[PDB]
Amino acid sequence: RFDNELQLRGLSVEAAVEELRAAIAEARALKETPLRVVHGKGMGVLRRTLRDYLKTDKNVESFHDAEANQGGHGVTIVNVKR
């Protein structure tokens, strides 16, 4: 069980990006990091599109897959700028 988990499974790419962008902006304002982005594995459509978005989000310090024990490739960890 975790804090700052964002549930994006079953969303469209556009909807998921919009939610992720809002969540990150919120986290930056509240000085909260890291975020756990729960997108699921599927055919990897959400993961790839959300990683693609994250490479240029102004608020992001870094991002990577979760550890194997904590969702792996179905979760992206976002380190938000402090």
Side-chain angles (χ1 to χ4, degrees), residues 1-81:
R1 185 175 187 211
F2 296 90
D3 260 322
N4 287 298
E5 280 194 325
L6 183 63
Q7 302 288 344
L8 297 183
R9 292 169 277 201
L11 295 182
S12 70
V13 164
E14 287 206 314
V17 167
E18 175 193 351
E19 294 306 310
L20 177 57
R21 177 174 183 67
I24 293 171
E26 174 192 80
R28 180 89 196 267
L30 305 182
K31 294 182 175 61
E32 284 177 3
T33 191
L35 307 188
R36 279 176 53 89
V37 183
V38 187
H39 46 63
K41 297 181 183 174
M43 294 309 298
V45 178
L46 289 189
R47 172 182 182 276
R48 285 187 301 268
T49 60
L50 294 170
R51 289 171 53 88
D52 175 78
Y53 163 84
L54 278 165
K55 293 139 182 169
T56 61
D57 176 301
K58 68 185 200 59
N59 288 321
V60 171
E61 187 164 331
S62 65
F63 62 92
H64 54 79
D65 296 325
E67 296 292 7
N69 54 303
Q70 311 195 333
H73 278 213
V75 179
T76 294
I77 306 301
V78 179
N79 302 302
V80 178
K81 287 181 179 173

